[PDB]
Design a protein around this ligand. Structure first.
Ligand code: NI
Ligand code: NI
Ligand code: NI
Ligand code: NI
Ligand code: NI
Lengths: 833, 140, 140, 833
């Protein structure tokens, strides 16, 4: 067949269309991903037929699926569908804009060529009544306040069209525009940042101009006015205007003034507030729905000065001598700027530009060019050598950190980064019995190998040894080898003696101890394991206990001051299939028999509605500080983030507000998979939050998709993984769009962008050198003096009791009961399976 | 004369008029770490046998007078991974009192004998002109 | 310069331990001496400290790269150490070099020979001026 | 579509279900792989529908396919089907246990949503009358013989459940169990290794306890009894029992004795023998069906001491201070132990634990903890720092070694390791005419490049140069460059002069010469080529001759003492399509014309039933010592192993037994692709058999799948490739399960785990250094003094004659004739295509 790659991919795309076609013919309402596959698939077939032109399919594509055939969110999610195919005259791109352009679509034609029977309308469900919607405050904003202003007559005396961007130095215009060049001096158009005025030939326009800000130095254009704005350089600019024949007619009468903050001043330009949000993303006071949850994030603070937003593109702001600085010291240009980002972080929900330098977050604030703009500090310069990642309208958060990882297969890793995870911590050596049961890399040799194995992958890694030992001998060895933490697991024996010996070792080496307790209460009940901690910091895995630990009351640990507790994700939150699923999963993982009295006793003692319900609440209470996966050993790597938001969404709907928005809950929860995993494991100076001085491990989200599927994963300042369409296409957006590794994941790049975390002892020996690692290696630290109070926004310490028969949990006197949700967000709207 | 000075003794610095007095000694008289034929640092005696192998000191400097801004004292000095691991009374916890877990002379421990000698930090010259490589050898 | 192209022994430089024994005692020092001598045009072998009544740290020095172990009286060459060391040599296929107990502290030469238990061992300066059972090590 | 990886994979899984659905609707009986795809596919669709709960689908999944719709082996092969999908309440795991739970299934529902017409029952074939079955000897085994014993009353005075594993030190139990602590001292439960006694609160049980073995040193638990078992530490344990409040009531009357080997002694525990095999795999005397062949392997020797088996898991044996040792010297802990393996190797079929250290096989025997178990040598310690690969119920064999490889494409390599091959030897430079015809890497430059190219791949490699030369000049060069062997091929000319010049070179460099002879008898008939050998060792490729060599009697070579002969795999064994396929394949590879007298003469002279039939027999006789692929140049990389067993299976059924089991044949054949390729090429000290001191290149098999598809490939002690399901799932087993690279195949690991083999001359020059290889490089050797008698279990030397007209082969006077088999095992039951 001589299949080129693009042919192979389209076969896949087609397969997805056909599956969507089969669901449609069943009278299922299609989700976003289904609508897309189906339409791209048909477009490709119509091109194969050879009967239809591009202009035709542009129309035909709007009339396949109608409001009736799709889910309530789809008409807002599907802005359009793009695909390329081979027409009779070669490859052509077809864009279908607003494909849900009607009520009924045309079923016959949506299925045409599939040979699937065409369903009747009444086979489809009835329409129900907008993910990531921006709720704009009512009103207008005056651009560019407190600046000298002038209105000038401008003529296009050329024979061709001339168009001028918002930030072009007006004196430097095409010599064929005629106006008062002297009055234009130091001025630029008073219009929304990044648009333009178009002058057809012969046209006369009356233009509102406003003064440039900051240092008021003009660079570029025609070099008419090179230099700082002053009386002396004005005289020189005018000399050059005359000599070089730049169109000039004095307007002695021109209205002059300033942009004053009051009503009906003719120099001022206003921008409708809904429209501000659409161009540049939301600003202070606006709220943003997280994905299709019920959560709203309100912009708390904005660094933007209205009218100088950093937007990149033709005629736009980020151009030489305008928004892009020219003449500052080269070493301080930002490597990359992320423009107009909504940052959601435990430390604040804000609107800001983010500058990246040397793989690090260099600054957060208002960025651009100090020669032309007020308010640009010397650490936020967009310069010649600065790349641009456009955040307008998107959310940025820290890369997620999953601190309960089983390295069972390398593909867990791709699934992780693709969901928004950039750091993994746990143990394993591949698909062995030991690794499948416990987060342990047991032999020094295997430490060596896992570090070397994962050395090119664009994530930060930590590996943990087997902590189950009643003598320190072999623990010293595994830490010296490079383990950055130890796992105490019952399958290797978690006994008071092992617990003690392992914590004494943690005290010496400043590493975290993660524990899965003695479910069987073989050598003690939970109180005996707590006693054995002896007031020493310890991280308790899946603290609720479905995934392991003292039956039935391991959850008591969420009330010990020295315990840092996490949950794993599959019990999150309590939903209608939770219990059934987990019982059987337990039966499967423990090789138990549905028909034996005691097998079923063990399992009913392990998987308990009363405690999972309590887990939803303690999680909302900030009594459980972290959420993690338990990847392929009871939990799900790609669902750390979504299960966090699904827990938040359920609690918002069940419980009281926590402090006219959901900010306090949003920040509490984002902390559970970003900052708190980093604190617990001892590397929070390097990652876990959007703050200056930390790795620029950064995930871009569409608000409509937030918490389900991100756009782009930045690793150490460079794009590591991202949504990507047809590699052969004329743009990146045509089908099939899927998460693929990017330049940050090829060759040596993964290593240059990331950190392998080891113990200080291992680093003292330079295991980075010994092991031949190209990834940066750093030591973990500051882990032996943590208490629950060091967990950001999750420092609650209830008195917990658990009834040994009913399993009912009481916290601070209050019986904890929670309902069984029948659905969750961030699921049916997003996934093809 | 055998073990170098102890608490209260004084030492003239070179041929200057300066005298350092030992402010503190970690030794427990009778268990000094001295290495040699018939001496203390031997298998099962002062050299430990059976502790976890990872915690043996790489090197021990025995019976050193330390002169340092922070104190003029008498101590064994334990080196591990190129770092100063411990300062104190070193030896074998199976046969001697007062030996902490970070001061074990083990099978894999080298001995530098400081009895009678003074140990100081490496000097740090912070006004250097790199005019020739030989300055460097003259410095160390 | 005298016509030697291979050297086998132990040490870490001019320390008390190396001046007395052919021992590179720590794994760290093995790494270092192999790195140190890496550009020198001679073949090199380094030997660890074999003086031990337990195999624990002996395993470690051989895994580090020692190609032989030295039993020296200055670290204790007692029948227990001799046995434990040769049992290790049987496992790792390395040569044991010995400088016996001159003091006959623990046994006379007969007793060390018994401790060999018929196993291959290299006896250093077998005449004994350089060390060993007085006055009859030469019997070996 | 923003497709995450898991979505892409499920689309594939769905496609496989739909194909299975199309075969079903045709009334085909489905095989294992089909049954799985089909059911997982439907489960996913039912979840898409949103109507059904997890508990529902658990039931619905058992009622889709019935005995009628599947092949005879399927009900035993399909223990269950797992898949995850997005329910209305997020991702949930559905396990369908024993999906063939009825006679008729429910066709309509198995096809539902495919829009395929539902077939009637009578469209399906009629049921015929168990791959990898264990045939257990009848009887019971007494556990733990010859040990002090005691029966004690135990009460649970706690308010929560307490459960105790078989190897927990009984004195160290939860303080709330009340019994005679002094009598419990040094004891543990006399129960099957790795299970448990459960005490609900308030429960009274009467427990059989038995003494611990080996050194009898207690470690861990509560540290009650720390130390060796003696009168002096008993007094201390009792002091601690009193002080710390561990439940204790004297039982002055307790029955005491020993585990005696006689009937009805109340201290002894017996395990039913069928049940022993199911828990721990078969033991001495049991037999195991190889895959779906007719071969049975009988356990010849077991190192297990009944009752101390090493089994890992919650409450199980391999826990701190029990089966996992605590206090031995850290350096001797095994890196990995494979527990309870059935080893099939040329040197014996046995039951043993396998210890791995430093990438090598360290020991084979009874492993565990010398403090608690008898019979544990100092080279088999499971310690803190030891990983566990569970072999119970599985077969381990050496990695296969294919010594007729054409490096035509890198994907051959993945196909190889995935079938169970870990070493490749041959020649090539990619898809060139030269490489497609001959196993030759001709230029030194290309040696350099193939070594560097394959440097990260987790297989051992050897590359062979072009040996066709009547002067040694260029041969010296290609060997000095790193060729570990030379190929003499007719396409480059295999003439007596070339043959001589090339063997004289082999004598100097100690490398193997592999030959494909002059089919055309251009310069001599076979006797002339044999004369030119001049009694020097030589490896003859595809000795039967379909794949090349003197027409029609190259097979004569299987009777020369200095010839080491191999077959390639596609003629293995003689089946109904063999001749037709090979004629056309010859026509295709030689660009011949069905319609030209002499083209068809050449081809009838090359592809001969009489000689292929003889190849089956000489192969069974041990007259042909090796089986190899001829990868993509007449043979099949993924079928070295299966074609070996398919040849064995056919011969078992056609010929006499070879020495109440198939051991002697099993060992003869396994030798053909493990040890004998390594001997022939000169690297048998490093690989080719399960023996101490060799690389731990090791393949795990399910007996039901043995010889078709393995579970897991261990390369140098670390898992390199393995079956792996959904990376996003809660366990590794949910669909789609496929062979994927593991941590041993990422980054630098492949190199750290493997060997590139070169000539000694190339190594003398340090080509490993010159070429910048990270893979270990070793020299081949001990190849110039081999004779047929050095081939393990394949040293037969018949007098062979071949009739020049009839092509009939006679060996030792006996005319060789063999039937044309209509089917083979290890095929229809296993493959989706
Ligand atoms: Ni766990
Ligand atoms: Ni886990
Ligand atoms: Ni000597
Ligand atoms: Ni051939
Ligand atoms: Ni070939």
């Amino acid at each position: 067949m001589k299949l080129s790659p693009r042919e192979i991919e389209k076969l896949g795309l087609h397969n997805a269309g056909y599956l969507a076609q089969k669901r449609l013919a069943r009278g299922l309402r299609l989700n976003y991903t289904e609508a897309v596959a189906l339409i791209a698939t048909q477009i490709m077939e119509f091109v194969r037929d050879g009967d239809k032109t591009v202009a035709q399919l542009m129309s035909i594509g709007r009339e396949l699926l109608g409001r009736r055939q799709v889910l309530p969110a789809v008409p807002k999610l599907v802005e359009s569908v793009q695909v390329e195919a081979t027409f009779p005259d070669g490859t052509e791109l077809v864009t279908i804009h607003d494909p849900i352009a009607c009520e009924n679509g045309n079923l016959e034609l949506a299925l045409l060529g599939s040979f699937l029977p065409v369903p009747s309308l009444d086979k489809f469900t009835a329409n129900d009544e907008i993910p990531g919607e921006i709720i704009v405050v009512g009103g207008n904003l005056v651009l560019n306040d407190g600046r000298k202003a002038v209105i000038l007559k401008v003529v296009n005396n050329g024979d061709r069209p001339v168009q001028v961007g918002s930030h072009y130095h007006f004196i430097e215009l095409n010599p064929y525009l005629t106006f008062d060049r002297r009055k234009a001096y130091g001025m630029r158009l008073n219009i929304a940042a990044g648009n333009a005025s178009r002058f057809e030939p012969g046209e006369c326009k009356e233009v509102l101009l406003v003064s440039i800000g900051g240092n008021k130095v003009i660079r570029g254009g025609n070099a008419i006015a090179d230099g700082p704005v002053n009386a002396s350089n004005c005289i020189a600019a005018m000399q050059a205007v005359i000599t070089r024949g730049f169109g000039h007619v004095e307007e002695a009468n021109a209205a002059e003034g300033q942009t004053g903050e009051d009503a009906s001043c003719p120099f001022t330009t206003v921008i409708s507030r809904e429209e501000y949000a659409n161009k540049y993303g939301p600003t202070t006071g606006d709220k943003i729905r997280l994905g299709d949850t019920a959560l709203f994030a309100e912009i708390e603070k904005d660094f933007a000065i209205y009218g100088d937003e950093c937007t990149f593109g033709g005629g736009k702001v980020i151009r030489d001598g305008m928004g892009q600085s020219c003449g500052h010291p080269p070493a301080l240009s930002l490597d990359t700027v992320i423009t107009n980002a909504v940052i959601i972080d435990y430390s604040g929900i804000i609107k800001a530009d983010i500058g990246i330098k040397d793989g690090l977050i260099h600054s957060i604030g208002k960025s651009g060019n100090p020669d032309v703009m007020d308010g640009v500090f010397q650490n936020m310069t967009t310069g010649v050598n600065t790349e641009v990642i456009a955040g307008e309208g998107l959310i940025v958060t820290a890369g997620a950190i999953d601190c309960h990882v089983h390295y069972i297969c390398p593909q867990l890793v791709y699934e992780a980064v693709t969901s928004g995870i950039t750091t993994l911590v746990g143990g394993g050596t591949g698909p062995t019995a030991g690794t499948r049961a416990t987060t342990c890399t047991p032999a020094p040799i295997q430490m060596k190998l896992m570090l070397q194995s994962t050395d090119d992958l664009p994530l930060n890694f930590g590996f943990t040894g087997k902590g189950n030992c009643a003598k320190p001998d072999e623990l010293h060895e595994i830490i010296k080898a490079g383990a950055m933490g130890l796992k105490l697991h019952e399958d290797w024996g978690t006994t008071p003696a092992a617990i003690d010996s392992c914590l004494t070792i943690a005290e010496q080496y400043d590493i975290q101890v993660n524990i899965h307790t003695d479910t069987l209460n073989e050598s003690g009940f939970v109180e005996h394991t707590i006693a054995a901690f002896k007031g020493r910091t310890i991280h308790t895995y899946h603290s609720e206990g479905a995934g392991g630990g003292h039956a039935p009351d391991i959850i008591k640990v969420c009330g010990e001051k020295n315990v840092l507790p996490s949950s794993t994700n599959p019990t999150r939150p309590l939903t209608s299939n939770t219990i059934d699923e987990h019982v059987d999963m337990l039966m499967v993982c423990h090789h138990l028999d549905a028909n034996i009295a005691e097998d079923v006793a063990f399992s009913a003692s392990r998987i308990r509605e009363a405690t999972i319900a309590a887990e939803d609440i303690l999680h909302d209470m900030g009594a459980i500080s972290i959420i993690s996966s338990d990847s392929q050993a009871m939990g799900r790597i790609g669902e750390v983030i979504s299960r966090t938001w699904q827990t938040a969404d359920k609690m918002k709907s069940a419980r009281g507000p926590l402090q006219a928005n959901d900010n306090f809950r949003i920040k509490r929860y984002v902390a559970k998979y970003t900052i708190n995993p980093a604190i617990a494991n001892g590397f929070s100076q390097y990652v876990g939050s959007v703050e200056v001085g930390k790795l620029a491990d950064l995930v871009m989200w569409k608000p409509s998709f937030f918490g389900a599927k991100p756009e782009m994963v930045i690793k150490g300042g460079e794009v590591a993984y991202a949504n990507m369409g047809d590699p052969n296409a004329s743009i990146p957006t045509p089908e099939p769009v899927k998460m693929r590794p990017m330049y940050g994941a090829l060759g040596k790049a993964g290593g240059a962008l990331s950190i392998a975390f080891v113990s200080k002892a291992a680093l003292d020996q330079r295991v980075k050198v010994l092991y031949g690692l190209n990834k940066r290696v750093e030591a973990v630290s500051n882990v032996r003096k943590l208490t629950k109070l060091d967990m950001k926004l999750n420092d609650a310490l209830p008195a917990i009791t658990v009834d040994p028969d009913s399993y009912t949990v009481t916290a601070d006197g209050v019986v904890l009961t929670c309902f069984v949700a029948t659905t969750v967000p961030l699921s049916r709207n997003y996934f093809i399976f | 004369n055998k073990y170098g000075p102890t608490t209260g003794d004084k030492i003239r610095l070179g041929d200057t008029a300066l005298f350092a007095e030992i402010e503190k000694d970690f030794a427990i008289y009778g268990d000094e770490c001295t290495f040699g034929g018939g001496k203390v640092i031997r298998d099962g005696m002062g050299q430990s046998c059976g502790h976890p192998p990872a915690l043996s000191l790489d090197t021990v400097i025995t019976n050193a007078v330390i002169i340092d801004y922070s104190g003029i004292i008498k101590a064994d000095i334990g080196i591990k991974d190129g770092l100063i691991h411990s300062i104190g009374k070193s030896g074998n916890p199976d046969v001697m009192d007062g030996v902490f877990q970070n001061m074990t002379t083990g099978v894999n421990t080298e001995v530098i004998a400081g009895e009678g000698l003074i140990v100081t930090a490496g000097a740090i010259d912070c006004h250097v002109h790199y005019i020739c490589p030989q300055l460097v050898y003259e410095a160390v | 310069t005298s016509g030697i192209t291979t050297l086998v022994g132990g040490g870490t430089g001019p320390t008390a331990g190396t001046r007395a024994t052919t021992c590179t005692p720590a794994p760290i020092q093995m790494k270092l001496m192999l790195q140190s001598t890496d550009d020198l045009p001679l073949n090199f072998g380094f030997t660890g400290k074999g003086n031990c009544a337990k195999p624990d740290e002996l395993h470690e020095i051989i895994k580090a790269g020692a190609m032989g172990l030295k039993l020296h009286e200055d670290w204790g060459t007692t029948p227990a150490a001799i046995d434990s060391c040769l049992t290790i040599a049987e496992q790792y296929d390395i040569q044991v070099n010995i400088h016996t107990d001159t003091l006959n502290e623990s046994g006379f030469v007969e007793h060390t020979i018994a401790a060999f238990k018929g196993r291959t061992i290299h006896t250093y300066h077998s005449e004994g001026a350089g060390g060993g059972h007085a006055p009859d090590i030469i019997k070996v």
